[PDB]
Amino acid sequence: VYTSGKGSSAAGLTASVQRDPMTREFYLEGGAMVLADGGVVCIDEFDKM
Amino acid sequence: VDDVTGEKVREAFEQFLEDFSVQSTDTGEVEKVYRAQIEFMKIYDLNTIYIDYQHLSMRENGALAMAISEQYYRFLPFLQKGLRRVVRKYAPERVFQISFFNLPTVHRIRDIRSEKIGSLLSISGTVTRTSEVRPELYKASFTCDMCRAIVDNVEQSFKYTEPTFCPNPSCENRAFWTLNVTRSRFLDWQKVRIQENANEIPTGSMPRTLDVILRGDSVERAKPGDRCKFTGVEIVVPDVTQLGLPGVKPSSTLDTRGISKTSLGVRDLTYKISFLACHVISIGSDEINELKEMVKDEHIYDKLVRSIAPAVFGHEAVKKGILLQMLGGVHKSTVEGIKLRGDINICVVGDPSTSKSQFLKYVVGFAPRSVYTSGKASSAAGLTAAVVRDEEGGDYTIEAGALMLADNGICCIDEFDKMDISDQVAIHEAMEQQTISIAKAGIHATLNARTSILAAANPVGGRYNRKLSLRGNLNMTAPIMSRFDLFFVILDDCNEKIDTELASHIVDLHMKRDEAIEPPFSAEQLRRYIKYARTFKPILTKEARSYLVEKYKELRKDDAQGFSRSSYRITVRQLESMIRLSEAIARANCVDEITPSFIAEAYDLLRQSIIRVDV
Amino acid sequence: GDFLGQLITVRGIITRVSDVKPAVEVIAYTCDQCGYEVFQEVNSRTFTPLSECTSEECSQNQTKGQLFMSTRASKFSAFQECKIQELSQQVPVGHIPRSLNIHVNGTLVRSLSPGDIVDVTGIFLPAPYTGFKALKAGLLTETYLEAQFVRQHKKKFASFSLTSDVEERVMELITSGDVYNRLAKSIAPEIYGNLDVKKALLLLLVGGVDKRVGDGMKIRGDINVCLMGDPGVAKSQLLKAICKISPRGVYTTGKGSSGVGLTAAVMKDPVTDEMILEGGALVLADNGICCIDEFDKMDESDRTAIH
Amino acid sequence: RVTLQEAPGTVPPGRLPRHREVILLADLVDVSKPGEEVEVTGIYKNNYDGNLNAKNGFPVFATIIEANSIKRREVFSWTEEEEREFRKISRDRGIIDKIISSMAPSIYGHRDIKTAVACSLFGGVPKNVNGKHSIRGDINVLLLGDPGTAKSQILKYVEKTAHRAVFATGQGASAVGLTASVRKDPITKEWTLEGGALVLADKGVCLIDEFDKMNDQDRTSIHEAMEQQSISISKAGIVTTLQARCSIIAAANPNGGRYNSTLPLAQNVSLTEPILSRFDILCVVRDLVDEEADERLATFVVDSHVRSSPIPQELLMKYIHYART
Amino acid sequence: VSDKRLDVDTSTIEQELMQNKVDHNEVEEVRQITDQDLAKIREVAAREDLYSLLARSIAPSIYELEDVKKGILLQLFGGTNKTFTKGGRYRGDINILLCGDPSTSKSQILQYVHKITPRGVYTSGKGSSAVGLTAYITRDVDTKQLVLESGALVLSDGGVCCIDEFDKMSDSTRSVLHEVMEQQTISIAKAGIITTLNARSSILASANPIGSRYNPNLPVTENIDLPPPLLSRFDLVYLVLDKVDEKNDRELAKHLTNLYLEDKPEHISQDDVLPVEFLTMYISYAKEHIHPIITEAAKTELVRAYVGMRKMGDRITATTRQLESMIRLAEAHAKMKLKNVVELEDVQEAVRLIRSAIKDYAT
Amino acid sequence: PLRDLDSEHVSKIVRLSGIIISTSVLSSRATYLSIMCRNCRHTTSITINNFNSITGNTVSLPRSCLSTIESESSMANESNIGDESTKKNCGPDPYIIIHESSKFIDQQFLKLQEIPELVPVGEMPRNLTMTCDRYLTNKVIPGTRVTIVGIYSIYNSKNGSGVAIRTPYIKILGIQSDVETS
């Protein structure tokens, strides 16, 4: 997964949790680390984060 | 008895309008004059009559005047029947409307009670949020399918359905409709909604709405943001949502002490006062010689300078600026394509303790098409549509709103800095596009606005800061700074001649003796002079356009060195502004084909107007 | 759910006690032709009015009469409902306090002040309802608790009159000798030192005396005390202590309550209507003592509220 | 079913437009395009009712204009005569500044930035390398402007020229704001994956102006679209990688004055370095007050305001299309 | 509506419902002035010491600041209501700030004025909003429609408002008062109603400095966090500070223990006569049947003193609001003691009411 | 392409290509259900096969106790002497599903959208409704590019109008993904 951020683009970089507006229910939203479990994550601009 | 009463008033009415109606001699206004109104109606075929109340107040010594004025709703069909027989006597499908006018005493909304039901009354207020134009049946052709279905009938009164008795043939009571959507006689009506006057309400409460219905002739005559006078008949409309008010509200349980035995169709009723009107007047030769006296003078520019606001004592450039805003540009189209603006935008920036609000008090106190707003509770829309949905079944009804009803007028706004950013988007869009785009929860739409903007801001530090640039004092965004021309800094110093003149003038103003600092022009004839001055539309036929060009060059030679003053470009929109200012000075002087001396006038006005800026 | 019908006893903190409004018991009509007075009992939540007659004279005739009601011949009863929250000392390790409704009828009304510790004893009935229609299985019942007799801990002054038996306990303290320094020793004895602080805080608990001067501008009437120093002088023990001795005493920390938490707020009211101002912390504890922790960390709006 | 309002140009002053419904039928579906003018010739009916019951006054029947013929007020390609006629202009050597001089009739000079506009919208080779990576086949244009320059007339002409171009402002705003996100649709209540303008303008040219008034949320998207040509989204229940191969023409704005000091552009503008690393060409507008530009400019100004060698634009707009295909 | 203990309503406001209510017989709306005590009104008007007697008899439980008590008396006699032909509309509003050190019984004055005023509304600082003073457009429950309420200044319409902690407003709040203090209008423009509506009112306020003690050799404008044009817009600005000397404090404590003793309201009976409720009908009778005019003979001294005030230049300054202030405060003094014209004499102490603060500006 | 779908294509085999927004919850239709009259005490069975006629329905329970259509004598005798002089009736709709000897299947309700590349420039992108059979459930993660082979059909139910307006939908047989792409 290639994230050049600051979060990119409309997807954040860490494991955020967003409540589903229907059902008022918690679920794992996503990010960069959780989608890429078992491999390599590449980051641009690590100082400018 | 009562039919002898109404028929008696009917024959007295026929006897009234058949007889003489003009008392005047040969120097008139000759006889009759009603038959000239019938025959003059016959030549054009428009099917209404406008009759006065004062002539009926003359004749009977007030006896019949006190017989139509109370029970007017009882006396429609007798009056309209007698007038129809007069028409079949003197004339060859007819729908007649008998709209009275010129009543003695005008009431407000607060004087409405419920003892005054039925009667006539003159209501004056303010139109806001008109609606659109839709038909209405009032002429039924509805009878049962077994067998005859050709009965013309009732529902002149609002029920609507259906015909009750003499049914069908042959299916008796209460067999009725299917109706017919092709055999009827319609007319069209809208429902405007008046709002109470601003100079009347009892201190202190809030304004109060009222509904009003217009049928027939007076469709479309109303105007959003104008005053009106109406016509009295004042019906009662059935209402629902007033339950649990508390009561005790009545009910209509029908009688059963008649019918002898061997269900509960009882009802509720709650009523609110509406209003019904049919005549709408929008009030709210010799003197062309006086216009000739107001054009043949030469000093009319200086007279129009010295005679705008007598309470103001001081400098004159803002008075010239107001006078130039009250006479617009040419606003003509171009090829193909993008039109040219157009209007002019003077925006006062100044110190507090300057009485800059009194300029706006005089402007909105004087000119037509004027809306004052002290914008902090603007809020958002506000200055746009709403859109208001719903009234009854798919209304999409658009509000006024505040920025848009001042069209071809002066929309004056206070205190840009205290207003937030979406306001500034709406202003910038309303100065660039000349339109307004709207997608507000449903109905997509577009609108239009052609206004002039007069602004009254405040500095950041509240004072000067002479040593700063002007741009550090605005505290507003960049692309709306570029549009405004021009800025008019005001600051005052100590100088004892100016001190004693101001003090003696203010103490004289707070004398009622004297109020006689009297202008060389009176109050209304200036307002008449604007209306004649609007009509000119000049196109210049002068070769000194190049002299205007190198005059703009010599404007752009001294500010190039240096930019330690107010570091402008100078904008080419200044060079376009020279055109519209020269046009306005031409419109005030009753002059076409502009001479270069006018270019020197407006050119020096922008010159010292930037000399007020540079510092 | 196996106590429905018995006569039980609970304890907890009252929260959200509502207003008192009349509820109907029997409704009295008049018949106007026969001359009877046709009553009707109402057990349910909603009722319906009735029609022509049900007597023995306007019945068995052709011409039935028509009846309409009257309000000086019915029978009313006061009615007020509130809620008990769990005491928060008798809870298991990982749980949250529950609640349970109470109806109150009759003379016992106006004895349930909000924010107390109470021992209500009453009988425990059902009252028919279920929630959403698609969740019903039949015949789910949704209980409440009728009230019978209310006994408070922390009995509130000045709702007492009797003196004769009371002097058997008071005159022992008066005849004990040196009442004042003894009572000053008695407030929170489990710390050491600071006799002067306890000495002043007894004067906080006494208070008085207000005075009207006929204008009428009012003077206080009350004492206001700060505490300073840090950290191991055991100041929180006194705040829990004196906010436990005095009845109607509310202990709020720094942040904590918002600005709207300790002023009042407006919320819609269920069954009794409508739009009552729900009180905050300060409106709850009036004529009492409002302890406050960590006064420096307060938001500045709260400072102007305190001022 | 198409509703219809009155034209905003010819409104009498003081009043408002109003609406009226128009029902279409079989052949006339999918001729119009919303927001443009129209011409209808239809009959005029009135819908009947639901059920007539005890309501208030008054009975009111709505109206319906059932349409019968629809015209525009009152789609470019080539045929064989234009592919054989195409070749004769192709052989000349002075075709280049003929193409530059045909671009902007309004702006008198500035041949360099107009050359950059022509090479911008004229395109390049994408291109793939066997078998791993592609380099870039697009030209991105940064144009350091100045208040008092006709850059909006240049790019506003480029909106008129090309095949697929979307003029998308930054903030204020107009749809859409460069960021793709799942949002509802107020006409049709189903949720829609609404792509951004960088999604929308693939194999075209987008138009973005006034960089200095933008969020970080937009700036990460502009940085994303020049990084690897792929916008990926992950909210809420959707996980895709949409492809986007745009070509951005910018329009900058200096800080305060027109050209603040002697300092270079990364010091002069208030932007950042990683958004300056990707932009290829850099245009600067000029100048301080000079005589011959005042003459030739102001004479064209009054030449434009008094009115109350190129190929015409149809052959060039076909020319660049068949060229880029 | 009327009452015998608090004040009585004006007449220039009432005139629409004076124009109404004559066709149909109703209730009185104005306190009925009897005939016998009117002779006592014309008797007490002949007293020489009325100017310190009435100002002494306002708040008999607070004892200092007789210039401040005197200005609070002059807020109850506010100006002359002159209406022009077109435009004009000049009220009799005057507006008072008073600040200084705390523990100075600022609050007692505000509660007492809040009792006396017929239509007073008492807000505070940091409990306000821009919505919070007008147009509470809401949903009424019993009819379930959208009904519009009047906020906090429309209820204040004619009478005295009060504001505490004038330092700690926002920028949005305190930007209301630039309209109310200047134009004497309010211009609501949002989605309910687009119509201006008036709220004539006499704003009284107070503020507490940074110190909280005032320190000398520090600028007076600096020690209260206001922009000094807005501080310059207020008519009468008091600065009440404390004295370190000893002689007054004996009489101070003797007043307090005079109040606490013998558990009965006796507070001031020696050696003073205090009217209980003569002064309310005195003020109302002084509010209807007088129209004071300020003709020729005083304009020399008035303009002379204004140009003398302009002399200082090269802290606070003086603008035309001082001149408007001096005529309205001056004719307000002429409204007292039943005189339909002003005199050249008594304008001097109408200057001295500003000059007492000016002597309190030296330090 | 999804933009041009006239009413000439009603009930034909028409394939297309789009982007799947969001799926729905696994439902349960029936295939073999065995019934019983609650008065007559009769038994039957019903098999149904094709089960996407959404607001039809495909079948209902019968509305009479169904025993009076009998080719036997003594069965007509006891069904005659349920009462004493008049005939008996289970009716109206008397039957009851027994849930302990039935069988059930699955149904998905996807939702599909055109690709946002072309040509929504002025417009808003438009969308349809899918439907899956037994083995086509739970195969597609929402997000992929697909090509559905389907039968463009029509159902009846209300909007979220008039007169005689019917909304369109697609029955699936069957689906295929991209290759792969992930």
Ligand SMILES: Nc1ncnc2c1ncn2[C@@H]1O[C@H](COP(=O)(O)OP(=O)(O)O)[C@@H](O)[C@H]1O
């Ligand atoms: N004189 C004392 N007697 C008994 N305990 C004390 C004494 N002084 C300090 N302590 C201890 O010091 C601690 C002070 O903490 P606490 O009063 O809870 O809050 P804070 O630290 O803010 O005062 C107490 O827990 C108490 O055990």
Ligand SMILES: Nc1ncnc2c1ncn2[C@@H]1O[C@H](COP(=O)(O)OP(=O)(O)O)[C@@H](O)[C@H]1O
């Ligand atoms: N040489 C020129 N010829 C014609 N118009 C010009 C010229 N130079 C500047 N302008 C005008 O000046 C305006 C400057 O616009 P600008 O302030 O850059 O718009 P923005 O709001 O995008 O900053 C342009 O709209 C253009 O019409």
